[PDB]
A and B are shown apart, each in its own frame.
Chain A
Amino acid sequence: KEALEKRKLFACEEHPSHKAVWNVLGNLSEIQGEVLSFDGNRTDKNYIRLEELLTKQLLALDAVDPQGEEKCKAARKQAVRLAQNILSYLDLKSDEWEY
């Protein structure tokens, strides 16, 4: 039917960006598994390691140079937003009221 990969997350196909982006995605996939099954507050061991660790992927993504190609420029941003989405999940499950 339609063989046109248009998914912003997996659309990048060039040479440099394509690999770094695909790597982060696997990284985020592994990490998300831990997050999805995380239990504790923002002081727990796991929360701090998963966060910084999620932050290491954000940093990786930031070092990517799409060289202008639209598909990788968008795939990077989509991956960034994906990582922030996993971060948001970790924060929501650990957030506790102030007063």
Chain B
Amino acid sequence: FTMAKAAAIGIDLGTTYSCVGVFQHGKVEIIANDQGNRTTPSYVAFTDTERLIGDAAKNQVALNPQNTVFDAKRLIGRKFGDPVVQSDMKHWPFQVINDGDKPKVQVSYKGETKAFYPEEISSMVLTKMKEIAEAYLGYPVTNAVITVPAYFNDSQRQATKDAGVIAGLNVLRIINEPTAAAIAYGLDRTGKGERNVLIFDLGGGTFDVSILTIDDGIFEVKATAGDTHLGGEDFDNRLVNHFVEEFKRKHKKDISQNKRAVRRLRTACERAKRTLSSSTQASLEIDSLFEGIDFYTSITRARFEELCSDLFRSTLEPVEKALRDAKLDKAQIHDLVLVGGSTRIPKVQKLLQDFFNGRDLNKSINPDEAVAYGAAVQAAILMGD
């Protein structure tokens, strides 16, 4: 095929999903997996007949919640005695045991029992991304740049690197997700000198705000803040709760106990939410939702914004905690960058914009892929471009 092979890939090893991109023929491409998806769930499932990673793992989750691992990023690099490990502890259907103070996920793989450290499960995820890229490029890939949250510590960063080495990757560098995002938008290639950049990363269940000062190739973190458990899922619930309650008022019946009915309503909401990010109104219609009763209703973007007024509101607190920590005043922020799928919600953008007196938002790059884009560019730079 080609005679000018790509020298390295950039990987966004995400909590819930991972993304991989490669710079080639002067451009960066985000690579789709076997199912044609630009992102791969960071899931590893251990059946009795095999081991699944990515979409396959996600899909069968319901069938094997006990041995379908995920969220290993929340554990990677942390000590079993780590507080957060404890909070997130039983919140997972899979087991998380101790071993010399090193956590491990206990699952039943092929009859017997197995236990792996977090970096091992992440190496699996990374192997999938490594193969996804090789599948598309038509040759082996070993060089890569992997991203980690800016608040990650040396131990967390080293474990992430260990995770890549175990996967056959020659890790050129471990960089911050916000640094990767800033790189994607070229915020470092301006001539204006020193720039204060704020990255607003709002995903499905994680919220991170970062303020970096970029100057002469240096990306110095000035502050990091966020909400560990705040994301798109929360906006979905409100919609779900809203409609469930509405169903009651009109049919005096509660469907919350019908797991199939809620699943359909939740999926119909997730879709309504997405529609509300481009239209001021969304129609929710599910045939024979409960006891043969049809459900044909609707909702306005405004009504939706009301149901989550407080949550959206909270979106700005981390923004202010961060400015405070960096000893900066909102007026000193030069660039704003949006990453994270939930930043597609209009109200989320307006709130951030209005907060910065109408400053433009860097958001045209797919918020789910921005970090991957930036890592890929960084990988290419490190190899000679």
A63 x B271 contact (CB < 8 A): yes
Query: Could you mark each residue 287-325 of chain B with 1 if its beta carbon is under 8 Å from any beta carbon of chain A, else 0?
Result: 110001010000000000000000000000000000000
Tell me, yes or no, whether A52 is within 8 Å of chain B by CB: yes
Chain A proximity of B3: nearest CB distance (Å): 42
Chain A residues closer than 8 Å to B263, beta-carbon distance: 55, 59
Prevailing SS type, chain A contact patch:
helix
Which of A12-20, A22-30, A31-39, A77-85 forms contacts with chain B?
A77-85
B267 x A59 contact (CB < 8 A): yes
Our pick among B62, B264, B271, B292 for the contact of A58 (Cβ within 8 Å) is B264
Q: How far is the CA of A28 from the CA of B260 in the complex (A)?
A: 17
B63 x A76 contact (CB < 8 A): no
Assuming the contacts A76-B287, A80-B288, A81-B288, asked whether A59 and B63 have C-beta atoms less than 8 A apart, the reply is no
Interface size on B, as a range, is 10 to 19
Tell me, yes or no, whether B32 is within 8 Å of chain A by CB: no
Our pick among A48, A51, A59, A76 for the contact of B264 (Cβ within 8 Å) is A59
The total of Cβ contacts below 8 Å across the A-B interface reads 33
Tell me, yes or no, whether A62 is within 8 Å of chain B by CB: yes
B62 x A48 contact (CB < 8 A): yes
Tell me, yes or no, whether A1 is within 8 Å of chain B by CB: no
Q: How far is the CA of A77 from the CA of B293 in the complex (A)?
A: 11
Tell me, yes or no, whether A6 is within 8 Å of chain B by CB: no
Query: Could you mark each residue 52-92 of chain A with 1 if its beta carbon is under 8 Å from any beta carbon of chain B, else 0?
Result: 10010011011100000000000011001100100100000
Interface size on A, as a range, is 10 to 19
Chain B residues closer than 8 Å to A51, beta-carbon distance: 260
Chain B proximity of A31: nearest CB distance (Å): 15
Cβ contacts A to B, 16 pairs, < 8 Å = A45-B63, A48-B62, A48-B63, A52-B62, A55-B260, A55-B263, A55-B264, A59-B267, A62-B264, A62-B267, A62-B268, A62-B286, A62-B287, A63-B271, A81-B287, A87-B260
Given A62-B268, A63-B271, A76-B287, 20 extra CB contacts under 8 A: A48-B62, A48-B63, A49-B63, A51-B260, A52-B63, A55-B260, A55-B264, A58-B260, A58-B264, A59-B263, A59-B264, A59-B267, A62-B267, A62-B286, A77-B287, A77-B294, A81-B287, A81-B288, A84-B288, A87-B260
Q: Which residues of B contact A (CB under 8 A)?
A: 62-63, 260, 263-264, 267-268, 271, 286-288, 292, 294
Q: Which 9 A-B pairs have the closest CB atoms?
A: A77-B287, A80-B287, A52-B62, A80-B288, A59-B267, A49-B63, A48-B63, A81-B288, A62-B286
